[PDB]
Amino acid sequence: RAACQTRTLRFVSNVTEADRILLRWERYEPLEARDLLSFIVYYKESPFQNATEHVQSWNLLDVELPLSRTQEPGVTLASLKPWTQYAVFVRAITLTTEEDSPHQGAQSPIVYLRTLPAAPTVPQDVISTSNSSSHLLVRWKPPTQRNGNLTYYLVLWQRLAEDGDLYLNDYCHRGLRLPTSNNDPREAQEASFQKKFENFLHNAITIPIDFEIQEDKVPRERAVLSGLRHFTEYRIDIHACNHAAHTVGCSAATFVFARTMPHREADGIPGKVAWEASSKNSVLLRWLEPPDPNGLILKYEIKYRRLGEEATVLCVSRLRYAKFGGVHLALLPPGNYSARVRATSLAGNGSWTDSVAFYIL
Amino acid sequence: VEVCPSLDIRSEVAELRQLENCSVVEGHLQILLMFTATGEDFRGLSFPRLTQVTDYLLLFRVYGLESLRDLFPNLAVIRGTRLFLGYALVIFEMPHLRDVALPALGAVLRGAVRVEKNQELCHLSTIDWGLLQPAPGANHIVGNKLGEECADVCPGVLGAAGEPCAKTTFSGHTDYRCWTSSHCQRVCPCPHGMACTARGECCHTECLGGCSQPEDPRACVACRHLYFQGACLWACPPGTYQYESWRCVTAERCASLHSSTFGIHQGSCLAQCPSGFTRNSSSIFCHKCEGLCPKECKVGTKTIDSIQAAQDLVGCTHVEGSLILNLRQGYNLEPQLQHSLGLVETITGFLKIKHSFALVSLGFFKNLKLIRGDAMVDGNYTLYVLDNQNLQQLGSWVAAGLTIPVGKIYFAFNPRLCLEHIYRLEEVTGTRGRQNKAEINPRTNGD
């Protein structure tokens, strides 16, 4: 019926795409008469260059040869993962009803074709921590789909300015929860939501080209960022890359937000606290703001007390402090008074300064 | 004032320029994936003319954008005719975003709100969604900045920007309601869904979002029920019909808007008539179907290789083209292929079946009645069954049901197809002498 002496079919043209493979081979016209034949193409994903024909594991594909003199048969394999090796070979069928006629089957050598690479998947499991006030340590995992030969990771970190609402407020009333640095130890609708927002990112590419983005390239799956400001938040974008100068580019970012450790003594008050009393029992105390605090200064707490009795505290906002450059203390019994001042920043409480002593008569 | 169909914007702030003259988006507005965007590009960009989005609003990874208070300073109503998985407003993974800030937002007619994974975004507990949505319990607002980690400063409260505004109750909390530190939410005394103005007196009932004069339908900024000729109406005038669930159009206008499958059943000019109704060429109104919808499907030469490749034809009755079945790797495909193919009643072109090793029988063409043969296989063939290793029944679309006007048939290499079935097909087709030997001849089919 079939499977007679076997001929050889040569591939005349191969085209590789990101997820397609176009193939052509010479037109094997049968040594026959008003008969019929067609080809069947076997292709399977084989990482290595060892594979066995005829056998399932393979994926079959029928191709009827066109009825003309030009346009060699050709096929277009589709839905192929990028940067994968595929073993392909074609085989003629040439089923005939002739009584006495050679069958003369034909097939082709197994040929391995590699499809073009594309941008890889976003990095997975990005974690970050701070070991000091000017360093950030970042770790992650390789992308799920490398889509090529992994070469490096593009790391970008951008400084984040504090929101303006902290600047205008009175934090003596309605206090808020202060932020902290980083100390990480370095359902159908939900699935559809994540699937849609992953298909959104599948078409996203990145060209490997108070706010200033600075670039870095890292070979391993870990990075250290140095020279940062103290107690300032940073946004970190991490893209996986491969041969991407001509490819569609690098991956999409996997940004995380990390804050550096507070500076230990950035909230200290410079110089010494001066004063200038008034004849109406009211006294005025002056002190200059810290130049570079941890984020910003929320309030000033001043502790004053008469010589001998208990202590009294007073909270002052930025607005009240800046309205006159200091603090007024009125309606007090005459005597010798001692005062200490502290600054409160986003990191937390500051350090008490030296005592200032004055008199009221 | 402007049509402005649904628009997706990506990858460039320049692409955001297609809303210059837009007034009402008759669709969904998407802004996403703007990696190379800074806080300077979005500072000088504003679209004050946009005042309504019919479908929904989505924002996804727009870098540099800090607030929507400048992008859409006059956006008022989100109709929510269709939803992004039930959400009319989605804001996801937005770096640098600090507040939602839609200061002119009047209502979200239908759909929930999803504001997730914006690490720098707060001012979300200072807004009551009860004065915006009718069912605020479906909102999904998690993953943002910690609620107690930022000061949701409203223009009133403590020493702030200035004049305060009213406070309501949303989830058992009586606190100030505000959008940003300067703009704060708008309320006014009258029953729900009654838009008001600067004077505080709320406008006509049909108004929505806002107005300019009270108790004047022509002065509304957004029509609650229907819109026509700069006025808000409970229903369209008798000479017009609804369109996109939001405006009134004449018959010829909505006929031109879809230029063949449109219909005006139940006073609503849709794009495809619903189930149970259809129209072909008469006056455009989806009258009730007799017993089934004669869906017509046009394909050039639809090669079929699997059930998934055949699910396209689901529900088709008249096929304008040819079918080329080739099912080799399947197993017991008859019940699966009956659902897809089997409502077909006429094939204008040819029918070919090659190398179908998985097809035990051709019984999934039960309603097939005619194969005219307009598209005709080379060699003067219309029915071309070739190389079917196990094909026994050849279906039941026989006994005077079948009719092939032109073109011959061709059966070859069907060992298990007994010649009795082929000869019965020849008899019921009414054309037996059309073919000749070696086209049906044994030693190939019928062993």
Backbone phi and psi for residue B420, each to the nearest 5 degrees, phi listed first: -60, -40
Q: What is the length of chain A?
A: 361
Count CB neighbours of B407 within 10 A.
24
Instruction: Look at strands A256-259 and A214-218 and give their pairing.
Output: unpaired
Vertex A155: Cα angle to A151 and A159 (nearest 5): 175
Chain B touched by A359 (CB under 8 Å): no
The contacts of residue B172 (CB under 8 Å, 6+ apart) are: none
Nearest to B234 by CA among B208, B259, B197, B212: B208
Is the distance from CB of B324 to CB of B302 less than 8 angstroms? yes
**Interruptions in chain B after residues (C–N over 2.5 Å):** 259
| Burial of residue B3, with CB atoms counted within 10 A of its CB: 0-12 exposed, 13-18 middle, 19 or more buried | exposed
Residues B367 and B171: their CA atoms lie apart, in Å, by 59
**Interruptions in chain A after residues (C–N over 2.5 Å):** 55, 186, 209
Both structure tokens of B192: 């729900």
Residues A102 and A94: their CA atoms lie apart, in Å, by 11
Among A39, A187, A194, A200, the residue to mutate for chain B (most B Cβ within 10 A): A200
Is the distance from CB of B209 to CB of B219 less than 8 angstroms? no
What is the torsional sign of CA B139, B145, B147, B152?
negative
| Burial of residue B49, with CB atoms counted within 10 A of its CB: 0-12 exposed, 13-18 middle, 19 or more buried | middle
Q: Which residue in this structure is represented by tokens 């799920």? A: A144
Nearest to B261 by CA among B249, B277, B245, B248: B277
Q: Which residue in this structure is represented by tokens 């929510």? A: B80
Count CB neighbours of A298 within 10 A.
23
Q: Which CATH superfamily is domain A124-259 in?
A: Immunoglobulins (2.60.40.10)
Nearest CA in chain A to B378: A67
Is the distance from CB of B371 to CB of B382 less than 8 angstroms? yes
Both structure tokens of B338: 């009956």
Both structure tokens of A274: 């001066």
Share of chain A residues as helix, strand and coil, in percent rounded to the nearest 5: 5, 40, 55
Question: For chain A, which residues make up each domain, given as ranges?
Answer: 7-114, 124-259, 274-360
Is the distance from CB of B91 to CB of B114 less than 8 angstroms? yes
Is the distance from CB of A169 to CB of A317 less than 8 angstroms? yes
Is the distance from CB of A70 to CB of A13 less than 8 angstroms? no
User: Shortest Cα distance from A166 to chain B (angstroms)?
Assistant: 7
Q: Supply the CATH classification number for the domain A274-360.
A: 2.60.40.10
Is the distance from CB of B167 to CB of B174 less than 8 angstroms? yes
**Partners of residue B39 in chain A, C-beta under 8 Å:** 211
Chain B touched by A279 (CB under 8 Å): no
Is the distance from CB of B327 to CB of B304 less than 8 angstroms? yes
Interface contact A67-B378, CB threshold 8 A: yes
Helix (H) or strand (E) run with residue A315 in it: strand A312-317
Both structure tokens of B327: 């099912």
Helix (H) or strand (E) run with residue A86 in it: strand A85-92
Residues A38 and A66: their CA atoms lie apart, in Å, by 9
**Partners of residue B153 in chain A, C-beta under 8 Å:** 165, 168-169
Residue type, B347: I
Instruction: Look at strands B24-34 and B57-62 and give their pairing.
Output: parallel
| Burial of residue B304, with CB atoms counted within 10 A of its CB: 0-12 exposed, 13-18 middle, 19 or more buried | buried
For A311, the 3-state DSSP assignment is: coil
**Partners of residue A119 in chain B, C-beta under 8 Å:** none
Nearest to B186 by CA among B210, B160, B219: B210
Residues A75 and A108: their CA atoms lie apart, in Å, by 14
In total, the C-beta contacts within 8 angstroms joining chain A to chain B are 84
Residues B120 and B95: their CA atoms lie apart, in Å, by 7
DSSP state of A196: H
Longest dimension (CA), chain A: 135
Method of elucidation: cryo-EM
User: Shortest Cα distance from A276 to chain B (angstroms)?
Assistant: 27
Residues A281 and A284: their CA atoms lie apart, in Å, by 10
CATH entry 2.60.40.10 includes domain A7-114: yes
* Bridge partners, residue B318, by sequence: B296, B346
Strands (E), B93-239: 107-108, 112-116, 167-169, 174-176, 226-227, 232-233
Taking the CA atoms of residue B222, residue B228, residue B233 and residue B235 in that order, the dihedral angle to the nearest 10 degrees is: -120
Residues A156 and A234: their CA atoms lie apart, in Å, by 10
CA end-to-end distance (rounded Å), chain A: 126
Nearest to A235 by CA among A221, A225, A247, A250: A225
Q: How far is CA B440 from CA A71, A163, A218, B391, B408, in A?
A: 31, 84, 71, 15, 11
Residues B99 and B118: their CA atoms lie apart, in Å, by 10
**Partners of residue B96 in chain A, C-beta under 8 Å:** 160
DSSP state of A166: G
Both structure tokens of B269: 């000019």
Resolution in A: 3.3
Phi-psi region of B374 (alpha: psi -120 to 50; beta: other; left: phi over 0): alpha
DSSP state of A197: H
DSSP state of B367: T
Backbone phi and psi for residue A152, each to the nearest 5 degrees, phi listed first: -160, 180
Here the contacts of B42-47 (C-beta below 8 Å, separation 24 or greater) are B42/B13, B42/B66, B42/B70, B42/B71, B43/B70, B45/B13, B45/B16, B45/B70, B45/B71, B46/B70, B46/B71, B46/B73, B47/B19, B47/B20, B47/B22, B47/B71, B47/B72
Is the distance from CB of B63 to CB of B34 less than 8 angstroms? yes
Vertex A82: Cα angle to A76 and A85 (nearest 5): 75
Is the distance from CB of B309 to CB of B288 less than 8 angstroms? no
Among B41, B56, B119, the residue to mutate for chain A (most A Cβ within 10 A): B119
Provide the b/e sequence for A190-201 (b: ≥16 CB within 10 Å): eeebeeebeebb
Both structure tokens of B295: 């869906």
Q: How many CA atoms lie within 13 A of B153 on its CB side?
A: 24
Interface contact A192-B386, CB threshold 8 A: no
Both structure tokens of B143: 């993953």
| DSSP sequence for B8-60 | EEES-SGGGGGGSS--EEEEEEEEEEE-S--TTTTTT---TT--EESS-EEEE
DSSP state of B126: S
Is the distance from CB of B219 to CB of B227 less than 8 angstroms? no
Is the distance from CB of B393 to CB of B418 less than 8 angstroms? no
Q: How many CA atoms lie within 13 A of A21 on its CB side?
A: 27
Helix (H), strand (E), coil (C) string for B82-106: CCECCEEEEEECCCCCCECCCCCCC
Nearest to A135 by CA among A182, A176, A69: A182
Which CATH class, in words, describes the domain spanning B296-429? Answer: alpha beta
Residue type, B290: E
Instruction: Look at strands B381-386 and B408-412 and give their pairing.
Output: parallel
